[PDB]
PDB file of C-alpha atoms and ligand atoms in Angstrom:
ATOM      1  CA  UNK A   1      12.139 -21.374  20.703  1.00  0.00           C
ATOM      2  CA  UNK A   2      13.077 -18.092  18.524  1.00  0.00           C
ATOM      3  CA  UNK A   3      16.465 -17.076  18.612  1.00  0.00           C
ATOM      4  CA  UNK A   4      15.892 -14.079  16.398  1.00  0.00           C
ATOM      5  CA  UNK A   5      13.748 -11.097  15.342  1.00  0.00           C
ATOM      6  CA  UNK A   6      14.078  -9.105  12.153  1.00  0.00           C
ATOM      7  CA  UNK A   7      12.497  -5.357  10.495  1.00  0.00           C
ATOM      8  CA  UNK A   8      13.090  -3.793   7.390  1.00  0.00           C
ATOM      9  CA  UNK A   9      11.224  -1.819   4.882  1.00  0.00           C
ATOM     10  CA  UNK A  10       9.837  -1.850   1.301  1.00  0.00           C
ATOM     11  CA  UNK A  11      11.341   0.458  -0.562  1.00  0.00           C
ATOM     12  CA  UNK A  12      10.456   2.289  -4.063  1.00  0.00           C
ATOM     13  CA  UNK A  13      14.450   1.063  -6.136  1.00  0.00           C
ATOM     14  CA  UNK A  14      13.938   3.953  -7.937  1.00  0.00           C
ATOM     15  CA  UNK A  15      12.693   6.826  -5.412  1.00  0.00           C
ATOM     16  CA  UNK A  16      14.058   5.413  -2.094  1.00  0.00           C
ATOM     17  CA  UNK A  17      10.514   6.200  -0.189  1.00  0.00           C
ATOM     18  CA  UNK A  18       8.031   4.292   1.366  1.00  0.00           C
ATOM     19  CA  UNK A  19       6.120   1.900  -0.559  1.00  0.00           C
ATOM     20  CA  UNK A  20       2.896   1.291   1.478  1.00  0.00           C
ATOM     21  CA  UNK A  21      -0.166  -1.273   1.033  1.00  0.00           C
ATOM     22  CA  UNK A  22      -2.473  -2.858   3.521  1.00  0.00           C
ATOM     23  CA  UNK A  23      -1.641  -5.041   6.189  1.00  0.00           C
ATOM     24  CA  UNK A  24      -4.195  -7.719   5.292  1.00  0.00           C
ATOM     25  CA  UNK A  25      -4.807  -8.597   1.843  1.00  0.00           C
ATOM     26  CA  UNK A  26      -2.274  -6.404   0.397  1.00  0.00           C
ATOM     27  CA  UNK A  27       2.028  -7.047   0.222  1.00  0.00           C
ATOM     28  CA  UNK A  28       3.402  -9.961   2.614  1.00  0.00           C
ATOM     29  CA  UNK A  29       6.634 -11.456   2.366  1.00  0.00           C
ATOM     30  CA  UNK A  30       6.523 -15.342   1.719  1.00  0.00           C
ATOM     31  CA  UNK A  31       9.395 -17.366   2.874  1.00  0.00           C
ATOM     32  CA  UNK A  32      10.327 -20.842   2.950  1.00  0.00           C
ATOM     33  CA  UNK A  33      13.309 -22.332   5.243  1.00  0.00           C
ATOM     34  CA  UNK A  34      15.941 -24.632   3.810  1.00  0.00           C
ATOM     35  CA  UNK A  35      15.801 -28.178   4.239  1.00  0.00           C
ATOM     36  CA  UNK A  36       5.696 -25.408   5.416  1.00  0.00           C
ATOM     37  CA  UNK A  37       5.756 -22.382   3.902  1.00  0.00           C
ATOM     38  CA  UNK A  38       5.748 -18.758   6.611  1.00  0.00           C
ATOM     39  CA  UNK A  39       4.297 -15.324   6.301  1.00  0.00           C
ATOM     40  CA  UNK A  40       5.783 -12.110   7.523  1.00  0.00           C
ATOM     41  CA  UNK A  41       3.693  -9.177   7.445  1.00  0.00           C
ATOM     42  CA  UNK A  42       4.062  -5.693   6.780  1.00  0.00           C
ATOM     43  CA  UNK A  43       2.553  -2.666   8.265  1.00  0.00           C
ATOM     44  CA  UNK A  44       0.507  -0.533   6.202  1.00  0.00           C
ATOM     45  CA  UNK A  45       3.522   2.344   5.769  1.00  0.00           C
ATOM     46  CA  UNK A  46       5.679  -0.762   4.291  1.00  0.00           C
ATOM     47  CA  UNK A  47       7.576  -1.238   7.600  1.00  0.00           C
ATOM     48  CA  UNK A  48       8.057  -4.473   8.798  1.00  0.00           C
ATOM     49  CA  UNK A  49       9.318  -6.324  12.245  1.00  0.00           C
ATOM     50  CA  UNK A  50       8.852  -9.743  13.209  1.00  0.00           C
ATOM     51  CA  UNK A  51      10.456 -10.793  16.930  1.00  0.00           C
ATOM     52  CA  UNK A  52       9.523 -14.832  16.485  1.00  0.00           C
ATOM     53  CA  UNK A  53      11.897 -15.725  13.654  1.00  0.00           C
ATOM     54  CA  UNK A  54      14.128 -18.629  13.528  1.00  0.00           C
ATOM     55  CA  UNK A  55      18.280 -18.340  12.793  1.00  0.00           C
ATOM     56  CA  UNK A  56      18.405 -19.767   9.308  1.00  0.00           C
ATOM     57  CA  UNK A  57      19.030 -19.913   5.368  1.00  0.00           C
ATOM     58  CA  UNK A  58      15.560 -19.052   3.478  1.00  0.00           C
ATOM     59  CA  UNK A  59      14.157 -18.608  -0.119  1.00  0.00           C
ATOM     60  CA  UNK A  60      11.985 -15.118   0.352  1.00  0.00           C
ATOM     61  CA  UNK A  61       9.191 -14.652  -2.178  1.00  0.00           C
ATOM     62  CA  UNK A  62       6.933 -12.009  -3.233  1.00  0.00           C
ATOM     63  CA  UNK A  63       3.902 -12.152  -4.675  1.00  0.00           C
ATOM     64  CA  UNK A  64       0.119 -10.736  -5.437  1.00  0.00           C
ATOM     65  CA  UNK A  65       1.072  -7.483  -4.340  1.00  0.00           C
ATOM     66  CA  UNK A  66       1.439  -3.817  -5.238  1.00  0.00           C
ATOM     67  CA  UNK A  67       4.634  -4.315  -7.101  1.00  0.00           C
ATOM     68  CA  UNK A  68       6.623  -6.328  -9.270  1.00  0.00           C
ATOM     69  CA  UNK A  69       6.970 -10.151  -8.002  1.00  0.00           C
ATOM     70  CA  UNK A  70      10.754 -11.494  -7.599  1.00  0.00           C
ATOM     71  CA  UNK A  71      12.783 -13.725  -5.478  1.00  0.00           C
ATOM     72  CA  UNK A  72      14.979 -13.276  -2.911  1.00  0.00           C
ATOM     73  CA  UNK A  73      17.111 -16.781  -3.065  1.00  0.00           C
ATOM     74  CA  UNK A  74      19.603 -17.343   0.109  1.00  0.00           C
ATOM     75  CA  UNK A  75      18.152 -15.286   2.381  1.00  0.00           C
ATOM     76  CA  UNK A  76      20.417 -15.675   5.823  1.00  0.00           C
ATOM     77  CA  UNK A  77      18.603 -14.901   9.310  1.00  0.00           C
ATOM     78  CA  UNK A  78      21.661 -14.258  11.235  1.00  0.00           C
ATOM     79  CA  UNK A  79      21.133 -15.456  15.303  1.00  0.00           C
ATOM     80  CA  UNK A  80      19.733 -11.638  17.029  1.00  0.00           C
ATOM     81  CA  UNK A  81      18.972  -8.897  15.162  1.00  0.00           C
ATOM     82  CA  UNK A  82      18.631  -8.451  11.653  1.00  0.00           C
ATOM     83  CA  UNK A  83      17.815  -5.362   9.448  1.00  0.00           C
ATOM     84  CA  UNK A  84      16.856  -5.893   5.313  1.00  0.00           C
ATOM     85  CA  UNK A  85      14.920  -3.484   3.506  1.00  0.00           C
ATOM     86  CA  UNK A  86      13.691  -4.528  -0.310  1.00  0.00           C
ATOM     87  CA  UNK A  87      13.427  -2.417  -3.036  1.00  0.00           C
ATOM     88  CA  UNK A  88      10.811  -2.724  -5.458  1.00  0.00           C
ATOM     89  CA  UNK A  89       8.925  -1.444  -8.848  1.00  0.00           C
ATOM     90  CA  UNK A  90       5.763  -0.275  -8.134  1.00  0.00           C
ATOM     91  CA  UNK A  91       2.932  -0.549 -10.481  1.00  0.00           C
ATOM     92  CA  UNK A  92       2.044   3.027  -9.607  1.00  0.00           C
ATOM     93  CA  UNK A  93       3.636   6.017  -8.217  1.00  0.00           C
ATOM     94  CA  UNK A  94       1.031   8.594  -6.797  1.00  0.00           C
ATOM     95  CA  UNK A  95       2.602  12.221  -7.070  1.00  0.00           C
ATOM     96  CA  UNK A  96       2.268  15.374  -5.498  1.00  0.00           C
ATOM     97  CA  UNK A  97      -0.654  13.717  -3.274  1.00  0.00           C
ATOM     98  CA  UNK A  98      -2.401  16.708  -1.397  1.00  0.00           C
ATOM     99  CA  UNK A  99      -5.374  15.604   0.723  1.00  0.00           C
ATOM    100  CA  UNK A 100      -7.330  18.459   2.367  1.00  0.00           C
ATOM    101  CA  UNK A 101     -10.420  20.122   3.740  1.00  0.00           C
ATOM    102  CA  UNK A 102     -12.324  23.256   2.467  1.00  0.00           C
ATOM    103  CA  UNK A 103     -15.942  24.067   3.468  1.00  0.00           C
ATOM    104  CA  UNK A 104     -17.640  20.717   3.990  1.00  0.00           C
ATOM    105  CA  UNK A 105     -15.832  19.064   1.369  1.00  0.00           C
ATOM    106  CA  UNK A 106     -12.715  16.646   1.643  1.00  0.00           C
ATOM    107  CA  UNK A 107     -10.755  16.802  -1.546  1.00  0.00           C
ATOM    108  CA  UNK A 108      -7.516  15.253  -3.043  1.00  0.00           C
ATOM    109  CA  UNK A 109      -5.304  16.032  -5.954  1.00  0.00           C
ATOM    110  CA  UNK A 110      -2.850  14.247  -6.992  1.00  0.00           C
ATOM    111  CA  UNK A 111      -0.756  12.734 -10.547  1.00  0.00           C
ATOM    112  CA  UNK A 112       0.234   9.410 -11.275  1.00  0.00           C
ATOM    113  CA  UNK A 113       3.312   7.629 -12.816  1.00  0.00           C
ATOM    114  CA  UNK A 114       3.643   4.014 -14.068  1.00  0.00           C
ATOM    115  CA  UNK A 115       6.439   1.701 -12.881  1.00  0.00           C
ATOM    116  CA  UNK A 116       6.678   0.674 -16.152  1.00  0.00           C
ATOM    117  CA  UNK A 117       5.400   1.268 -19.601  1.00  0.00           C
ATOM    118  CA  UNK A 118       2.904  -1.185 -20.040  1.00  0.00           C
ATOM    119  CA  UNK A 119       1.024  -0.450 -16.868  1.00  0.00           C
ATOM    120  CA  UNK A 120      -2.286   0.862 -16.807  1.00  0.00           C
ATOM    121  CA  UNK A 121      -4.648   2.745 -14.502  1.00  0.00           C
ATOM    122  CA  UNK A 122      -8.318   0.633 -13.527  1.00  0.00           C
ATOM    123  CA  UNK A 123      -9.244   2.586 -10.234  1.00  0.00           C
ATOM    124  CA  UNK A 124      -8.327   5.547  -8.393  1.00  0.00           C
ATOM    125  CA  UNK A 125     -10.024   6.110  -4.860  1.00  0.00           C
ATOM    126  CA  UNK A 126     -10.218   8.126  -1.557  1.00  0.00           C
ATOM    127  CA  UNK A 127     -10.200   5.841   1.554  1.00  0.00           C
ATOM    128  CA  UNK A 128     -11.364   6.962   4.381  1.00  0.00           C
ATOM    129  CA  UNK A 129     -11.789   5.974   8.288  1.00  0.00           C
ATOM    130  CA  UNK A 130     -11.481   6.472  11.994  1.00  0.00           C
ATOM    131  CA  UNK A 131      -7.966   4.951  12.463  1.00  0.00           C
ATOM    132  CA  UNK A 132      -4.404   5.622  10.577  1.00  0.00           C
ATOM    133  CA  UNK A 133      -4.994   1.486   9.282  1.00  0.00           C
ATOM    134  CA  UNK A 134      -7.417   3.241   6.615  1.00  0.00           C
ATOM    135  CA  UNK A 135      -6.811   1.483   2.656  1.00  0.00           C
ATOM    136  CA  UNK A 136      -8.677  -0.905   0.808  1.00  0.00           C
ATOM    137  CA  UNK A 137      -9.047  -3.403   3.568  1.00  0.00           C
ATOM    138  CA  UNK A 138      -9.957  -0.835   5.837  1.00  0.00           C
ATOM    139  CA  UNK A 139     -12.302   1.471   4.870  1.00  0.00           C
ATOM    140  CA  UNK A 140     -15.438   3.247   5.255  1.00  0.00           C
ATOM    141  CA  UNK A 141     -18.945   2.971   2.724  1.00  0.00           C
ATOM    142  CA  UNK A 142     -19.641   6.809   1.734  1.00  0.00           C
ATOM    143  CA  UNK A 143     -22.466   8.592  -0.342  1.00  0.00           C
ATOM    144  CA  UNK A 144     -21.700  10.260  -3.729  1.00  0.00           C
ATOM    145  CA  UNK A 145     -19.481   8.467  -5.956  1.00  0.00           C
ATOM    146  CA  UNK A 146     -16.713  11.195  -5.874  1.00  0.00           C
ATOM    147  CA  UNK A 147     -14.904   9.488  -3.900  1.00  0.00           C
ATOM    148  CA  UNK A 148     -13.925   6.580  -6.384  1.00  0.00           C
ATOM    149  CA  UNK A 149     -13.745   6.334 -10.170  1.00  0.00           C
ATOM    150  CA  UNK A 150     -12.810   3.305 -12.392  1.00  0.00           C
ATOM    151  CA  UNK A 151     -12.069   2.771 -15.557  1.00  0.00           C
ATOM    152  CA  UNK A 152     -13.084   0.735 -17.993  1.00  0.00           C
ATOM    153  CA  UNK A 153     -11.169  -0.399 -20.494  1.00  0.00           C
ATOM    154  CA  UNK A 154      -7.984   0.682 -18.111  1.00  0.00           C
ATOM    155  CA  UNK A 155      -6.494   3.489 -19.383  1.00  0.00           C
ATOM    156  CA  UNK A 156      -3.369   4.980 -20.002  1.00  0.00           C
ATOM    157  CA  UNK A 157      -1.306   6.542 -17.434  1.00  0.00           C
ATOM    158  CA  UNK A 158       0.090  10.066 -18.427  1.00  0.00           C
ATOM    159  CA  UNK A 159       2.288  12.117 -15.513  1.00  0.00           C
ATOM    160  CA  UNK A 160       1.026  15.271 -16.391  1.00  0.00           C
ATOM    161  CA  UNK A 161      -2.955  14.278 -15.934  1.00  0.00           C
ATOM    162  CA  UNK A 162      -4.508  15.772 -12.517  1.00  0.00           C
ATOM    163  CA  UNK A 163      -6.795  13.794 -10.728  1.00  0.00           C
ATOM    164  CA  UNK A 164      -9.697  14.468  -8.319  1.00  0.00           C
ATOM    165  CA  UNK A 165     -11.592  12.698  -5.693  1.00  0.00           C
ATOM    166  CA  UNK A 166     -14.079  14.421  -3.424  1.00  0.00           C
ATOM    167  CA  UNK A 167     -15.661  13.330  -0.507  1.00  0.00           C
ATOM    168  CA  UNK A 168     -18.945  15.647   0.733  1.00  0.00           C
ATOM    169  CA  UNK A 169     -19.182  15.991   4.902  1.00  0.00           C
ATOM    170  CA  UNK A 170     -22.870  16.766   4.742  1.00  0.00           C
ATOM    171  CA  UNK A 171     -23.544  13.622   2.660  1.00  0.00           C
ATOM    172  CA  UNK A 172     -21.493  11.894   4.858  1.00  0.00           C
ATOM    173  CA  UNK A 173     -22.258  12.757   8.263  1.00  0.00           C
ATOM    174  CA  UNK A 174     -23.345   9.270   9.472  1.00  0.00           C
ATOM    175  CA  UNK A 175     -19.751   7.749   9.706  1.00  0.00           C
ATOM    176  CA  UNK A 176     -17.468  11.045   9.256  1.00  0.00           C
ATOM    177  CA  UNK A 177     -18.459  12.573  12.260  1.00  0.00           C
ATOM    178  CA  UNK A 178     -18.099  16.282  12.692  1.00  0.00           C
ATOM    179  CA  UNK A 179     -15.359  17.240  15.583  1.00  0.00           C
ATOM    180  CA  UNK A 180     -13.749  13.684  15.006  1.00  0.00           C
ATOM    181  CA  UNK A 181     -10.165  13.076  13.466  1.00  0.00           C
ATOM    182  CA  UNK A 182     -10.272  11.024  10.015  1.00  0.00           C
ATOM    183  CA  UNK A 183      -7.349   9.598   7.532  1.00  0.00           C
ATOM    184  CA  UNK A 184      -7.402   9.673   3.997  1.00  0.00           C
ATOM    185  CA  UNK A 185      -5.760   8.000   1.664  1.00  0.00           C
ATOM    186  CA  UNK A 186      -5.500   8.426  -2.069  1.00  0.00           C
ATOM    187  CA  UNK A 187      -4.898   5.054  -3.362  1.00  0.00           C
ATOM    188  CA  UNK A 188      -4.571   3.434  -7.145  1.00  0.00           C
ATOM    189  CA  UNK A 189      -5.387   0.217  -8.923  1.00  0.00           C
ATOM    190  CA  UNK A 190      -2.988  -0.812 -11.596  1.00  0.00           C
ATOM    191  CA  UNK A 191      -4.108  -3.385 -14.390  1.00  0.00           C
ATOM    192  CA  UNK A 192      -0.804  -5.582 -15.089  1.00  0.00           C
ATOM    193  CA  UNK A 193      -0.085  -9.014 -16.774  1.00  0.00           C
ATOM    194  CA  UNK A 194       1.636 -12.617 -15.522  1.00  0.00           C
ATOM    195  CA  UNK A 195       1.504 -11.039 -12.119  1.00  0.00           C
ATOM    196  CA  UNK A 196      -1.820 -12.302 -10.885  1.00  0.00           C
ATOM    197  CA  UNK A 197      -3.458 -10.570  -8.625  1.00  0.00           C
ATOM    198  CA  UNK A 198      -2.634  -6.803  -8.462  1.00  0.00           C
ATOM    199  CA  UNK A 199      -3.279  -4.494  -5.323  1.00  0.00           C
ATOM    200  CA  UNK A 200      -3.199  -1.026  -4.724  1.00  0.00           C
ATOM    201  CA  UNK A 201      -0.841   1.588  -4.521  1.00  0.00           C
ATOM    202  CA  UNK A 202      -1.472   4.442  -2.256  1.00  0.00           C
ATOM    203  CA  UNK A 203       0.314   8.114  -1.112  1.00  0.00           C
ATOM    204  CA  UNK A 204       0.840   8.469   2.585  1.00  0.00           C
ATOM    205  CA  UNK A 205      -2.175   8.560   5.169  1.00  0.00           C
ATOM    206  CA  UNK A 206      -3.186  12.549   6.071  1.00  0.00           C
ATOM    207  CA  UNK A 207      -5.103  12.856   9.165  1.00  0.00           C
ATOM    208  CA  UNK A 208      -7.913  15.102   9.352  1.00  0.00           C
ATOM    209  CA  UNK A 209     -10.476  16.525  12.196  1.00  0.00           C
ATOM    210  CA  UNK A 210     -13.556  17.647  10.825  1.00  0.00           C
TER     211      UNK A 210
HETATM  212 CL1   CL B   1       9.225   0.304 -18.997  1.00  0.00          CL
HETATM  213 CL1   CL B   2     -11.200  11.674  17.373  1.00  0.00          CL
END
């Protein structure tokens, strides 16, 4: 059987924090043992801990996710416990997110910056649900339109630019339920080449009760 467990984090290389995504169909980390092909998954904060791993040498892969794709060659899971946190280029930075409440209107400001220069910005939206799991996989259908904008063509991502999202209660009321706590989460679609498919990037999860 298993002879070892390992946990880690994804980290930003440049800002040391956090990088989060969705559990399902968002970052995973694709390895391959010398000598088929596993899956370790990553909670949506970009934590990670898998206690079913076997002592070995493996190639680690990334790929299809919210940053820039590389390799990890020689990977060694050493027999016990084992700690390895990657740093990563996002495609998208979300700054000063601020998610909050006033009247019977949910509203988040926030600014963006691009992990490199050639990124650009398709969507920007405001997830929302019942549980702290809440992202693009895991979200709730709401009235308005405020809540998500996209762009087309993608445009160009400027650090100074303010964005806004808005979610209305009253419009709203069938599945953000008044006296019930809610988490948001500001989350952006970059549009970047010869990396296939691109996910979102998101700020960190702020609970709510309406
Ligand atoms: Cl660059
Ligand atoms: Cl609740």
């Amino acid at each position: 059987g298993p002879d070892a467990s390992i946990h880690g984090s994804i980290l930003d290389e440049q800002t040391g924090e956090l990088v989060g995504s969705d559990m399902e169909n968002g970052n995973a980390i694709k390895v391959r043992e010398h000598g088929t092909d596993q899956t370790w998954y990553i909670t949506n904060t970009g934590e990670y801990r898998n206690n079913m791993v076997f002592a070995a040498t493996y190639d680690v892969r990334f790929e299809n996710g919210n940053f820039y794709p590389f390799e990890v060659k020689d990977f060694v899971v050493k027999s016990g416990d084992n700690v390895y946190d990657f740093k990563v280029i996002p495609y998208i930075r979300v700054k000063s997110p601020k998610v909050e409440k006033n009247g019977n209107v949910i509203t988040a400001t926030f600014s963006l910056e691009a992990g490199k220069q050639e990124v650009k910005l398709k969507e920007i939206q405001l997830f929302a649900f019942s549980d702290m799991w809440v992202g693009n996989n895991v979200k709730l259908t709401l009235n308005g339109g405020t809540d998500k904008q996209v762009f087309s063509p993608s445009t160009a991502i400027n650090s100074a630019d303010i964005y806004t999202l808005s979610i209305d209660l009253g419009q709203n009321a069938d599945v953000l339920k008044y006296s019930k706590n809610y988490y948001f989460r500001i989350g952006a679609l970059a549009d970047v080449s010869g990396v296939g498919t691109v996910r979102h990037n998101y700020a960190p999860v702020v609970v709510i009760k309406l």
